[PDB]
Amino acid sequence: AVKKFKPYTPSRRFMTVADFSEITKTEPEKSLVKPLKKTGGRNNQGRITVRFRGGGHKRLYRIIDFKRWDKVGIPAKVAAIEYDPNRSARIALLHYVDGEKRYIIAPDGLQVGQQVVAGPDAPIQVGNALPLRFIPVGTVVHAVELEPKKGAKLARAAGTSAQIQGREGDYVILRLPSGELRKVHGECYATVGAVGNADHKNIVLGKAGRSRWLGRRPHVRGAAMNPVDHPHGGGEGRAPRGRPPASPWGWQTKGLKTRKRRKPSSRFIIAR
Amino acid sequence: MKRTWQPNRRKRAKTHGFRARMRTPGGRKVLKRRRQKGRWRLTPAVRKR
RNA sequence: GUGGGAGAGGGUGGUGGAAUUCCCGGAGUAGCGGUGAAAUGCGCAGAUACCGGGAGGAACGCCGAUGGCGAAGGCAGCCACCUGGUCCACCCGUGACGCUGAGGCGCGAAAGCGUGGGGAGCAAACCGGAUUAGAUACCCGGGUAGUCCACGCCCUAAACG
RNA sequence: CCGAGGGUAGGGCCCGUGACUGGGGCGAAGUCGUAACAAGGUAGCUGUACCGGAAGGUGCGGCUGGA
RNA sequence: CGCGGGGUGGAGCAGCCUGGUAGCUCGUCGGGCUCAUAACCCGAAGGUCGUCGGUUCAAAUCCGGCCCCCGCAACCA
RNA sequence: GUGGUUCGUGGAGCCAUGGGGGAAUCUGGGCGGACCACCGCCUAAGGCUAAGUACUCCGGGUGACCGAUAGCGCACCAGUA
RNA sequence: CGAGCUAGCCCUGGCCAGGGUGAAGCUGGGGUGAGACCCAGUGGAGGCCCGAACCGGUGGGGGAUGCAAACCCCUCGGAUG
RNA sequence: CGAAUGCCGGCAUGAGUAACGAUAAAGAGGGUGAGAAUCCCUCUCGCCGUAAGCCCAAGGGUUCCUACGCAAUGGUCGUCAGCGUAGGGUUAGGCGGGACCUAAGGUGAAGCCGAAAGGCGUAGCCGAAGGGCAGCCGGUUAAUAUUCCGGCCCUUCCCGCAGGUGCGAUGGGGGGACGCUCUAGGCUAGGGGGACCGGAGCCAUGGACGAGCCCGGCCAGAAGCGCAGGGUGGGAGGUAGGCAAAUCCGCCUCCCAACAAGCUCUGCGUGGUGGGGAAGCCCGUACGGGUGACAACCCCCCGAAGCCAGGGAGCCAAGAAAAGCCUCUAAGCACAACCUGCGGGAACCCGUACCGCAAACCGACACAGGUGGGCGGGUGCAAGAGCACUCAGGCGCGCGGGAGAACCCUCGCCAAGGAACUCUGCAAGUUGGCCCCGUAACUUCGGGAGAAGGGGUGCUCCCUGGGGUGAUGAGCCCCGGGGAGCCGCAGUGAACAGGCUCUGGCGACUGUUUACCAAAAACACAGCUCUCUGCGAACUCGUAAGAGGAGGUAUAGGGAGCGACGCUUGCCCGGUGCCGGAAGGUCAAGGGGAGGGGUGCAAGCCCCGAACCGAAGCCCCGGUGAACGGCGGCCGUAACUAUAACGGUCCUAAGGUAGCGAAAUUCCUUGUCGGGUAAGUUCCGACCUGCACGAAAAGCGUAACGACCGGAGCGCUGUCUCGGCGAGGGACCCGGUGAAAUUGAACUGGCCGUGAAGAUGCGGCCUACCCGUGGCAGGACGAAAAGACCCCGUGGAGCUUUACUGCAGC
RNA sequence: UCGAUGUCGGCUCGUCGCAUCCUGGGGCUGAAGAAGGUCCCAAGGGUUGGGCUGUUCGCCCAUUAAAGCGGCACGCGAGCU
Ligand SMILES: NC[C@@H]1O[C@H](O[C@H]2[C@@H](O)[C@H](O[C@@H]3[C@@H](O)[C@H](N)C[C@H](N)[C@H]3O[C@H]3O[C@H](CO)[C@@H](O)[C@H](O)[C@H]3N)O[C@@H]2CO)[C@H](N)[C@@H](O)[C@@H]1O
Ligand SMILES: [Mg+2]
Ligand SMILES: [Mg+2]
Ligand SMILES: [Mg+2]
Ligand SMILES: [Mg+2]
Ligand SMILES: [Mg+2]
Ligand SMILES: [Mg+2]
Ligand SMILES: [Mg+2]
Ligand SMILES: [Mg+2]
Ligand SMILES: [Mg+2]
Ligand SMILES: [Mg+2]
Ligand SMILES: [Mg+2]
Ligand SMILES: [Mg+2]
Ligand SMILES: [Mg+2]
Ligand SMILES: [Mg+2]
Ligand SMILES: [Mg+2]
Ligand SMILES: [Mg+2]
Ligand SMILES: [Mg+2]
Ligand SMILES: [Mg+2]
Ligand SMILES: [Mg+2]
Ligand SMILES: [Mg+2]
Ligand SMILES: [Mg+2]
Ligand SMILES: [Mg+2]
Ligand SMILES: [Mg+2]
Ligand SMILES: [Mg+2]
Ligand SMILES: [Mg+2]
Ligand SMILES: [Mg+2]
Ligand SMILES: [Mg+2]
Ligand SMILES: [Mg+2]
Ligand SMILES: [Mg+2]
Ligand SMILES: [Mg+2]
Ligand SMILES: [Mg+2]
Ligand SMILES: [Mg+2]
Ligand SMILES: [Mg+2]
Ligand SMILES: [Mg+2]
Ligand SMILES: [Mg+2]
Ligand SMILES: [Mg+2]
Ligand SMILES: [Mg+2]
Ligand SMILES: [Mg+2]
Ligand SMILES: [Mg+2]
Ligand SMILES: [Mg+2]
Ligand SMILES: [Mg+2]
Ligand SMILES: [Mg+2]
Ligand SMILES: [Mg+2]
Ligand SMILES: [Mg+2]
Ligand SMILES: [Mg+2]
Ligand SMILES: [Mg+2]
Ligand SMILES: [Mg+2]
Ligand SMILES: [Mg+2]
Ligand SMILES: [Mg+2]
Ligand SMILES: [Mg+2]
Ligand SMILES: [Mg+2]
Ligand SMILES: [Mg+2]
Ligand SMILES: [Mg+2]
Ligand SMILES: [Mg+2]
Ligand SMILES: [Mg+2]
Ligand SMILES: [Mg+2]
Ligand SMILES: [Mg+2]
Ligand SMILES: [Mg+2]
Ligand SMILES: [Mg+2]
Ligand SMILES: [Mg+2]
Ligand SMILES: [Mg+2]
Ligand SMILES: [Mg+2]
Ligand SMILES: [Mg+2]
Ligand SMILES: [Mg+2]
Ligand SMILES: [Mg+2]
Ligand SMILES: [Mg+2]
Ligand SMILES: [Mg+2]
Ligand SMILES: [Mg+2]
Ligand SMILES: [Mg+2]
Ligand SMILES: [Mg+2]
Ligand SMILES: [Mg+2]
Ligand SMILES: [Mg+2]
Ligand SMILES: [Mg+2]
Ligand SMILES: [Mg+2]
Ligand SMILES: [Mg+2]
Ligand SMILES: [Mg+2]
Ligand SMILES: [Mg+2]
Ligand SMILES: [Mg+2]
Ligand SMILES: [Mg+2]
Ligand SMILES: [Mg+2]
Ligand SMILES: [Mg+2]
Ligand SMILES: [Mg+2]
Ligand SMILES: [Mg+2]
Ligand SMILES: [Mg+2]
Ligand SMILES: [Mg+2]
Ligand SMILES: [Mg+2]
Ligand SMILES: [Mg+2]
Ligand SMILES: [Mg+2]
Ligand SMILES: [Mg+2]
Ligand SMILES: [Mg+2]
Ligand SMILES: [Mg+2]
Ligand SMILES: [Mg+2]
Ligand SMILES: [Mg+2]
Ligand SMILES: [Mg+2]
Ligand SMILES: [Mg+2]
Ligand SMILES: [Mg+2]
Ligand SMILES: [Mg+2]
Ligand SMILES: [Mg+2]
Ligand SMILES: [Mg+2]
Ligand SMILES: [Mg+2]
Ligand SMILES: [Mg+2]
Ligand SMILES: [Mg+2]
Ligand SMILES: [Mg+2]
Ligand SMILES: [Mg+2]
Ligand SMILES: [Mg+2]
Ligand SMILES: [Mg+2]
Ligand SMILES: [Mg+2]
Ligand SMILES: [Mg+2]
Ligand SMILES: [Mg+2]
Ligand SMILES: [Mg+2]
Ligand SMILES: [Mg+2]
Ligand SMILES: [Mg+2]
Ligand SMILES: [Mg+2]
Ligand SMILES: [Mg+2]
Ligand SMILES: [Mg+2]
Ligand SMILES: [Mg+2]
Ligand SMILES: [Mg+2]
Ligand SMILES: [Mg+2]
Ligand SMILES: [Mg+2]
Ligand SMILES: [Mg+2]
Ligand SMILES: [Mg+2]
Ligand SMILES: [Mg+2]
Ligand SMILES: [Mg+2]
Ligand SMILES: [Mg+2]
Ligand SMILES: [Mg+2]
Ligand SMILES: [Mg+2]
Ligand SMILES: [Mg+2]
Ligand SMILES: [Mg+2]
Ligand SMILES: [Mg+2]
Ligand SMILES: [Mg+2]
Ligand SMILES: [Mg+2]
Ligand SMILES: [Mg+2]
Ligand SMILES: [Mg+2]
C-alpha cells in the first residue's frame, strides 16, 4: 500500500513509509528463539573495508530458520508476523506442536493461524518446505538451498522468488530472481511461495537522514576527490573523467566482468 | 582553546605503562635502551589508587 | 410473481493447441533474404531447407454468417466461479407507481502520460539500401518507444445509421 | 459621536501604450515543390503520436464520404 | 608581430610529396523527346594554374620575395 | 629457477638449493672451468673436536693525551634539572 | 613512538528553558446505492518556526613585541537531529 | 681569528621608554608594625546572583589548619599570601572502587597461519560513570565526617538452638530486559500568601500604636496504619520441544478468573522517639559564642523536567549483555543439606585533606582562552534557565596619585539635506515584545506569512462571565467581557526582542567544509541511470590464517556518474574502452626430432637443430554512447533593394536536434534596440553576428528555502555635504616596578651636481648656538623574513599519461 | 637594488613646471558692435557637483569665469583603503 505524507515539510513531500498492516499485534519480538546481540561495526580487524558504513539505529538479530529439515513432518501454527530490522522481508513467528518456536521468513499470503510444515510429505501450499524434487515443475518457490543441507541462500529478499523450470537427473533447473538459469540439486529444500512485502521497492527514503537511520554513510564521488584519492580526482573546474570510468582502486566500472572464469560452479549455470 | 594535553591516569597507564612496553618487541627495546641509558624512570610515573 | 430460452454482454482465477522468434543437439551443404529489378542484410566461424528438444510472449484458425450481445465504446480458443441486460409463456400480484431529463454523477476506441512488470511478433522516431532532379515518402534490410499485464491518469474520433 | 474631503498602504476590473514576438486577414502576372480532386499515379478522411523546408510522411485504432 | 594551411575553366574540387600527361561533378552551348518547360537522351565548347623572379632540357608540380584568404598563438609578470 | 665465488649468462665449471624427473655400493661415485678421451686427485648425502683469532662492561699499567668553552653528555649526588 | 589534539566508527551514559505552527489518525455531522470526498472538534506529527542553554563562526570594528602562537566586542547560523 | 644572519658566555642601546593582564569603584575611621593606598577590624559605596553562589567527577598532589617569618616567587607595596621553616590534619560492613556481572575492545587454553619477530582465534578470563548491592537526620575539630559521637534503621557471612521441605548445579526455564515523541492520576522537592502562632525590638522627618514594621513559623523517623501506584491469572490432564534429566518452561485440551477481587512490591503521608529553631541585642576574636526560646513550629495557594516506574498512548528508524534473584531437576547426598524465626559471634583491602568554570585542572605566567554532571531563591516584563533589580552567598579582577592637549579606542547627541559617501548603505541607524484588524504575484496547495500595512498597550473606579482548590460557598490562584474616568512628550514609559519591498544568477531543500585568511554556486543529499556480483558472491584489507561484505542472498551487495521536482535528454560505434566470437594469422615454455657438430678404436658420451604439435594476448569479425569521446567547408538563387524557403559542390565516423544565448560562457564590446535614472561599461527585457551554449562533466524551467552573489525602490541615518560637542579607558605629569625587535662606528643639515646610474658622509655653494619634552610620518633605498615571482642547479618532492623500466594484481 | 627598492586605482595632504583652462596685459584678424579666431606676455589666485566602471581615461547629466596639461619612485600603504 505504502504510507504517503503531505508536504507539511520539504522532504516530507516525497517521503514514504511501508504499510505495517501485516504486522500482527506483536511489534516487540520474542526472546528465547532470538534475539542475539548484533555486532555493529563498519570494518574488519582494524581498517574499513566497505566504505560509508555506520551510524543508524541499534538492532537486535532475529536468528531465523534457514534449514527447515530439522522438523520434517512436524507441523507448526503460524502465530504472528513481525518487523525484522535486519532484512527487507518480514518474519513469521511460528509455534510447532512440538512446543518449539522458530521464525520463518514470511512469504506473501501467509495468514496467522495457518498450518505450515516441512518434508517430502507436505501439501504444496504457501509456507511449506520440500526438497526441490517433489515440488511440481513451474511452481514458484523461495528460500532455496544451493547445495543440500547447507541452508536457504536464494530468494529471501522482499518480493523475490524463483520458478522451477524443469529437471535433469538429480538436478532441477531454477530461474533465480536475477533471471539466471541454475541447476540446483534435487535434494535442496525450498519453501513454496514468493517472499512478500513486495511494496518494499516502492518506498521513497525522502531525505538524507533516513539514509543515515539505516546506517548508510554519505558516499562521495571520485570526481569530488583528488588524484591521490581517486582516478577521477582533479583536475580543474569539473572534468569529464579522461579515462575509462574506474573504481578508486583502478579497475574499470562500466562493463568489466568480474566473476572468475574457471569457477567449478560454471557447469551448473545456464544464464545471465 | 582546547590544547593537546588532556591528562588521564588510566590512558597514560594503559598507553605508556611498564606492562604495555613489556607486551611487544618494540616496547621491550625501549626498556632496554632506557636501562642502558641509566634512566631513573623507565616508564612515566602514573599516580593515584 | 411463476416457469422457461438464446447470446463473442461484464469481472476474476485456471487452461489448450497452431504458428513466428531465439537457444541446444542431429543431419546437411553454397548460397539464403528480398524486389518491378535490385541492393542493403544474413551465410563455410556451417546460413537457408530438414528432424529432435527447450524457452517466451502475443493472437485465437476451421466453426464464422450478408450471424449473435451490449447503452455506446466495444465484445470471439476452452473451462469454472462471480455478474448485468433481455425475449417468450402463464395471465397470478401492485396499482398511474409514467415519459423526458438542465445540472450532477458514472462509462467511454486508438494514441498519450505515471509507477512497476513483460517483451516473441510487429513497429512511430531513427540507421541503412534502392527509387527520384531531389525522397527528410512510397518498396527493401534493421530498429526504440509503444503494442501486452496491474494499478492511477487522460475524455478525443468519420465516438457514424 | 458622526461626518464632506484630504492622506497613507494594499488589492480588484477596465482602457491606453511598449523594444520585441506569435500566428491571422488582405494585396492582377516573384520562389520551391505536387499534398488533394480520376485509383490523383501511395484510396481518402480521421482522433492521436512522433518526424520533416513546405505541402506533408509514418505508426496505431477508426469511418465510406472508396474499391 | 610569430606560426602553417591555402589561391587551378562560370561554381565547388582533384592534379604536386616520386617535375614531362591538367581530371571529376555541376553549369554553359548545339541537337533530340514533349503541345510546351523541366527531367532524360546524343554531341560540343571552355583553364595567363594569384602575381615577380631561376631551377632544370622541361615547372600547376621544385626553391626564394612581395599580394590578398583561412586557421592557430601571444604565456610569467 | 636462484644464491655463493673474481665470475654482471659468459665457453660458466665448482659449492649450496625452491620445482620436476630420479640411480648405483668399489668393475660403486664426485672433482681437476662447457664437452669427450686419456692421465690423475678425492670418497658427498650423520655428528663432535682444544689452541692460535675478535671484543673491552669490569681491574691494572703507561702517555712528545685533555686540563673545567678542554677531556666522557657528567671532575660537582647527571642520563639529573 | 604517537588518535590524552584532530578525523571516522564501535560500546555505555548524559543534555536540549519557554513559546509558535497544527499533518496523519480518531469522533460527530454532511454526502452516496456503497464510496470518494467536505465541514467541524479532537489529536499532536515535522532533518517545521521564534528563542536561551548548548553547538557554531556571518559581517564589521578592536587586537597585532596581544589577555590570547586564532583572543575580545557588537552582529549573525543551527538549536528533536 | 675580526667578520661565517658562526658557537657559548658576559654586558651595552632602544630607556627610566612601552607596559603593569578586562572601565565591576572606591572612600574613611581604628588597629598592628622598623616600615602600610596595598594586612586585620568597623562604617559608607559599587559589582555578580542559570553566578562571579553551592555540590559532585576528572585532573592536580599538601596547595588543608596553625605558629613563627619576608631574601626570592606576587607585574607596585606588603607586616599579607596559594611563598620560607616547623608542627598538626584525611577515621566507613551501609559513600565510591575491589574479595559481584557482563559491553565494545583486549587477552586467549583448543585450533589455524606466518622466514624470525609475530598474525588470527568460537571456550574462559580481563574490561564500566551500564546491571547488582545494605544509612538517614543532627552534633562535635583550628583542620575529617552519610567515616567520629547521638538517635533511629539496615546487610551479608559463621555457629547454635526451634519449626519447615526431598535438599541439591558452572546445567534447563523465568526474570533481569531496555527505543523515540507525547502523555494521564496521585504525590514530593521547591516556592508564594496568612487577619493565625512565636519573637528581641522599633514609632524616625509631616502622618501612623496599626488585624503596623521587622524576623521566623521546620527536619529525620522503624512496625502498624492510610492514600496513590507498579508488577502478577488459579486448577487438572497430555506432551514427541527447551541439546542429560525436570513436577519447571514451552505447545495442545478441558474447567473456573478476568477482576488488579487476591497475593506480593515500591513511593508518599502518618507515625514510638530524636533533632533543629530568626531578626535584633550583648560580647573580644583572624570569628564563632551567648541571649532571643519552655521559641513558635499552624491554615491556604502554585507546583515539577524529580518520585510511584517495568505507568499509558502514538510512531518507525524497531530499540545491550551477564550476574544477583525465582524456579526445575543431575550426579551425589537424604544422621546430609536448604528455607523461615530467634540468638550469639565474624565483617577485610584502597579512596576520604584542600582546589575543582579555576591564582591549585589544560594553555612556559596569580594568562580576558578551554573544562563534563546536579542545586541554582524572589519580583516584574505573555512565557522561560531570556532581561532589569535583588536573597543566600561571593567579589571590587595584586600598581597607584593627578591632570582634563593632539590622536586612538568604546560611547552619547546633533541645524538643514538626507546615500550626494563608497568597490558596496561597509558601518551605523530605522524596525523590534505581546493582543487585534489586515494581507498580493506565484504555488509542488503545505505555503508564500511576521507578507505588506495598520491599530491597541499605563493607572483609577463601577458592573460582569468562565474555570481551579475547597463542599454544592468564603477565601486563595488562574483565564475573560463591558462601562465611565485620570496623568504625562511619551504607558512591552527602564532592560531583553525583525528594517521592508521588487527583480536577476546559482544551488532544489535541513545539512557539510579548507582546526589558525575561502562557509560558497564547492561536498553531501533524497532521486535517476549504467555496470559488476548465484553466494566459499563481487569488492576491500591481509604474505598467510583470517576478517569486513553479512549471520545479508538480485526488492540484495559493490563501483561509476548525474543530483528535489517538471518537460526532456537528438545524430556518430570510424579511433579508444568494455562486451561477444569452440574459424583463421601470429604467438613462450614444453613436445618433436629431418638434418648437422665435438670427442672416442669403438660400443658410446655431449652439443646445437628444420618440419610439425603448442595457451592467454595481440591481430581480425561483430556489438555497445546516462561507455572515452565527437557532432563541417565553399559558391548560387525570389518581379525595389535586402535577405534566402530553394540549388550546386567538396569532405566526414556523423556534420549539434529541442531548449537556451553579449551568458558565472561574448574576443571585437560600454554589440544594437527597449526598460529603470536628470544622467546607467553595472542591472532587467529583447534581438542573434554562439571568438568559444546545448541535453545525466546533463539541457531548459521551477514554488519553497540561503550569514551565497548582482540590480532597484521605500523607510532611516554622522556614510557623506562637514563637521561640532560631550562621556569614559589610554595618551600627558608625579611616586613604584620596568621590557623589545634593532644596533659597523658616528661628531648623522638643504640645494645643484657628482659617484655602481636615487648622497648626512664626495664637490661647490647655501643654511645652521649647545641639550631636551610632546606630536607628524617625507627620508635614512627605515625594521622584519638568505624573494614565495623570475631564471639558474645535469637540486627535491606531490601529481599525470598510449614516457622508460619494473612490481603487486589479474 | 632578488640575505625584498610593496606592485593599480582611490582617499588624505601637498608642492613644482609652463608647452596657460580661466581671470590680467597685448599684436594681427577675412576685428562694424557684441562675440570669436590666432599669436605673444604672463603663473598671482582659481580650476564645481553628480550617473556609469576597480578603473586611469573616457562617455554622459546639471552647472561654470574656467571645469588646463604634466612632474614629484605611473608623488604620497613605518598615512588610510
Ligand atoms: N488567402 C490565402 C490564405 O493565406 C495563404 O496564402 C498566402 C500565400 O500562400 C500566397 O502566396 C502566393 C503563392 O502561393 C503563389 N505560388 C505565388 C503568388 N505570387 C503568391 O501571391 C501573393 O503575392 C502577390 C504579389 O505580392 C499578391 O498580388 C497576391 O495577392 C498574394 N496571394 O499569398 C497568400 C496571401 O495573400 C494560405 N496558403 C491560404 O490557404 C490561406 O487561406
Ligand atoms: Mg537471553
Ligand atoms: Mg586488518
Ligand atoms: Mg590488535
Ligand atoms: Mg555523492
Ligand atoms: Mg577538489
Ligand atoms: Mg590516480
Ligand atoms: Mg572547464
Ligand atoms: Mg579527471
Ligand atoms: Mg391479473
Ligand atoms: Mg432518463
Ligand atoms: Mg479512453
Ligand atoms: Mg491504449
Ligand atoms: Mg521510480
Ligand atoms: Mg521488423
Ligand atoms: Mg520498415
Ligand atoms: Mg520524379
Ligand atoms: Mg459506422
Ligand atoms: Mg497591457
Ligand atoms: Mg504584432
Ligand atoms: Mg496522399
Ligand atoms: Mg497528388
Ligand atoms: Mg494519393
Ligand atoms: Mg494519422
Ligand atoms: Mg517518416
Ligand atoms: Mg608567476
Ligand atoms: Mg653472482
Ligand atoms: Mg657435476
Ligand atoms: Mg679436482
Ligand atoms: Mg680432489
Ligand atoms: Mg667448536
Ligand atoms: Mg696541557
Ligand atoms: Mg664540560
Ligand atoms: Mg679558569
Ligand atoms: Mg657538556
Ligand atoms: Mg483534523
Ligand atoms: Mg510541535
Ligand atoms: Mg528545527
Ligand atoms: Mg532557533
Ligand atoms: Mg677576516
Ligand atoms: Mg649573546
Ligand atoms: Mg622613545
Ligand atoms: Mg611617551
Ligand atoms: Mg604609559
Ligand atoms: Mg590588574
Ligand atoms: Mg547589581
Ligand atoms: Mg609546598
Ligand atoms: Mg592557608
Ligand atoms: Mg601570621
Ligand atoms: Mg614585590
Ligand atoms: Mg604578573
Ligand atoms: Mg611587623
Ligand atoms: Mg606555607
Ligand atoms: Mg582476602
Ligand atoms: Mg573481578
Ligand atoms: Mg568477567
Ligand atoms: Mg592475540
Ligand atoms: Mg573474543
Ligand atoms: Mg560498577
Ligand atoms: Mg554500595
Ligand atoms: Mg572542610
Ligand atoms: Mg528441589
Ligand atoms: Mg539455575
Ligand atoms: Mg539463566
Ligand atoms: Mg512626626
Ligand atoms: Mg517524617
Ligand atoms: Mg530432555
Ligand atoms: Mg540558636
Ligand atoms: Mg511502558
Ligand atoms: Mg559467568
Ligand atoms: Mg573527607
Ligand atoms: Mg571534602
Ligand atoms: Mg560547572
Ligand atoms: Mg591577577
Ligand atoms: Mg584564568
Ligand atoms: Mg561547556
Ligand atoms: Mg528553577
Ligand atoms: Mg517574557
Ligand atoms: Mg542573566
Ligand atoms: Mg544632522
Ligand atoms: Mg532633524
Ligand atoms: Mg526621507
Ligand atoms: Mg554614488
Ligand atoms: Mg564620488
Ligand atoms: Mg549592491
Ligand atoms: Mg549593515
Ligand atoms: Mg535578491
Ligand atoms: Mg534569489
Ligand atoms: Mg544550498
Ligand atoms: Mg567547523
Ligand atoms: Mg579557514
Ligand atoms: Mg554559511
Ligand atoms: Mg570565515
Ligand atoms: Mg567472511
Ligand atoms: Mg556476519
Ligand atoms: Mg547498483
Ligand atoms: Mg551538482
Ligand atoms: Mg555535480
Ligand atoms: Mg546523449
Ligand atoms: Mg564511436
Ligand atoms: Mg564498432
Ligand atoms: Mg568502438
Ligand atoms: Mg575480446
Ligand atoms: Mg589463441
Ligand atoms: Mg548574444
Ligand atoms: Mg563561449
Ligand atoms: Mg536609457
Ligand atoms: Mg542602454
Ligand atoms: Mg556546460
Ligand atoms: Mg553528457
Ligand atoms: Mg545541475
Ligand atoms: Mg543552510
Ligand atoms: Mg563622524
Ligand atoms: Mg574623555
Ligand atoms: Mg612612572
Ligand atoms: Mg642589519
Ligand atoms: Mg644626488
Ligand atoms: Mg668626511
Ligand atoms: Mg655634501
Ligand atoms: Mg619617517
Ligand atoms: Mg636568496
Ligand atoms: Mg640533464
Ligand atoms: Mg629584486
Ligand atoms: Mg639589507
Ligand atoms: Mg627593507
Ligand atoms: Mg610663456
Ligand atoms: Mg586677442
Ligand atoms: Mg543609484
Ligand atoms: Mg599636480
Ligand atoms: Mg611610467
Ligand atoms: Mg596609470
Ligand atoms: Mg605610485
Ligand atoms: Mg598597508
Ligand atoms: Mg618607509
Q: What span, in angstroms and rounded, lies between the C-alpha atoms of A66 and A56?
A: 27
Alpha-carbon torsion angle A114, A116, A122, A128, nearest 10 = 110
Concatenating the DSSP letter of every residue in A37-59 gives E----SBSSSSBSSSSB--S---
> Among A255, A256, A66, A267, which Cα is nearest to A181's?
A267
Q: What span, in angstroms and rounded, lies between the C-alpha atoms of A173 and A62?
A: 31
Helix (H) or strand (E) holding B30: helix B25-37
Q: What span, in angstroms and rounded, lies between the C-alpha atoms of A165 and A183?
A: 10
In this complex, the answer to whether residue A5 has its CB under 7 A from any atom of chain H, a nucleic strand, is no
Helix (H) or strand (E) holding A16: strand A16-17
Q: Å between A207 CA and H469 C1'?
A: 50
Tell me which residue has cell 519480538.
Answer: A29
Close Cβ partners of B28 (under 8 Å, ≥ 6 residues apart): B21, B22
Q: Å between A87 CA and H809 C1'?
A: 35
Read off the C-alpha cell for A228: 591521490
Close Cβ partners of B3 (under 8 Å, ≥ 6 residues apart): none
Compute CA B14 distance to the chain's CA centroid, rounded to the nearest angstrom: 8
CA of B46 to the centre of ligand 61 (A): 27
CA of B39 to the centre of ligand 82 (A): 82
CA of A12 to the centre of ligand 39 (A): 21
Report angle CA A52, A58, A63 to the nearest 5 degrees. 105
Method: X-ray
Q: What is the resolution of this structure in A?
A: 2.9
Helix (H, G, I), strand (E, B) or coil at A103: strand
> Among A140, A148, A111, which Cα is nearest to A124's?
A140
Tell me which residue has cell 624512570.
Answer: B41
Q: Å between A54 CA and C132 C1'?
A: 70
> Among A78, A118, A103, A110, which Cα is nearest to A194's?
A110
Q: Tell me the ligand closest to A238's alpha carbon.
A: 8
Read off the C-alpha cell for A179: 533471471
Tell me which residue has cell 539505516.
Answer: A214
Q: Å between A109 CA and H228 C1'?
A: 49
Q: Which nucleotide is nearest to A181 (CA to C1')?
A: H534
Q: What span, in angstroms and rounded, lies between the C-alpha atoms of A269 and A267?
A: 6
Compute CA A156 distance to the chain's CA centroid, rounded to the nearest angstrom: 5
Q: Å between A237 CA and E52 C1'?
A: 54
Alpha-carbon Rg for chain B in angstroms: 13
In this complex, the answer to whether residue B38 has its CB under 7 A from any atom of chain F, a nucleic strand, is yes
> Among A121, A133, A127, which Cα is nearest to A103's?
A127
Q: Say if CB A35 and CB A60 are below 8 A apart.
A: yes
Helix (H, G, I), strand (E, B) or coil at A210: helix
Q: Which nucleotides of C are covered by protein (CB under 7 A)?
A: 54-56, 115-118
How many helices (H) and strands (E) are present in chain B, helices listed first?
Answer: 3, 0
Read off the C-alpha cell for A213: 537511520
- In the Cβ-directed half-sphere of A82, how many Cα atoms lie within 13 Å? 21
DSSP state of A133: G
CA of A48 to the centre of ligand 113 (A): 62
**For residue A142, what are the β-bridge partners?**
A191
